[PDB]
Amino acid sequence: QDNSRYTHFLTQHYDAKPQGRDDRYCESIMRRRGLTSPCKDINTFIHGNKRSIKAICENKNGNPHRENLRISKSSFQVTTCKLHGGSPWPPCQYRATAGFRNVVVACENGLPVHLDQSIFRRP
What we know:
alpha+beta; CATH 3.10.130.10; 4-stranded antiparallel beta sheet; 3-stranded antiparallel beta sheet; 3 helices; 7 strands; globular
């Protein structure tokens, strides 16, 4: 799976331009992306252009972080979908939280392949 990890990243965490980042948006995009067989308990999408997210992998927009991660220097429009209900099986009900801040990703070959969801599990 060469560069198939980056594609998967985009599929689970990227949405160039959403419209309303409300609950319905979450239930819709989570379903559409297929993050609904067992319902994912929390998932965050990054908005904006891809060039910017990719740059987090170079010093252009990233800083080393924790063990083996990278934290972006710029902020991103973001939407976090939190599962609601206490059942990992559909229908999957999500609560949306729109936000604006930097993100933490893991890079491989200059490409994002993992988003650290911990900074959004804003408890």
